[PDB]
Amino acid sequence: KVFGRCELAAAMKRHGLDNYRGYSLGNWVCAAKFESNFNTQATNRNTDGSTDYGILQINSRWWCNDGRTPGSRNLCNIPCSALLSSDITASVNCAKKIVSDGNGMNAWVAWRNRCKGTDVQAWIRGCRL
């Protein structure tokens, strides 16, 4: 599924991401835009042979099982394919564990490089939330 900007902002808000670990909703929408262009089916291979899955490009190195990332963990206890669903529940629940891990949203290099410090409120501008 390719979410609309406000559609994804509403779904993240309903799933309790708004101000989760102190990150305002625009931070999450901005991260999703640059990680996946709001496409749940986005996948990208990392240099290390891990893969990133879904709207928030969650990595098989630590967070999900894809059966092809040697010596990896599955800390969200899900198959990585669950992260490609039209229903963002699994992505959001796993994102909450990642952002609680100690480095906040710096875990998402595209958030650090492209969202951090920017006017992230612009990402929820005009949305009926």
Binding residues for substrate: 101
The secondary structure element, H or E, covering residue 5 is helix 5-14
Site string for Na ion, 70-99 (x = CB under 5 A): --x-x-------------------------
Region of 29-37, 41-49, 61-69, 87-95 interacting with Na ion (CB under 5 A) = 61-69
Interior/surface letters 27-56, b for 16+ CB within 10 angstroms, e for the rest: bbbbbbbebbebebebbeeeeeebbbbbbb
Give me the residue label for tokens 């410090």: 117
CB 80 to Na ion: min, Å: 7
Which position among 7, 18, 48, 52 bears the catalytic label? 52
Q: Is 59 in the site for Na ion (CB under 5 A)?
A: no
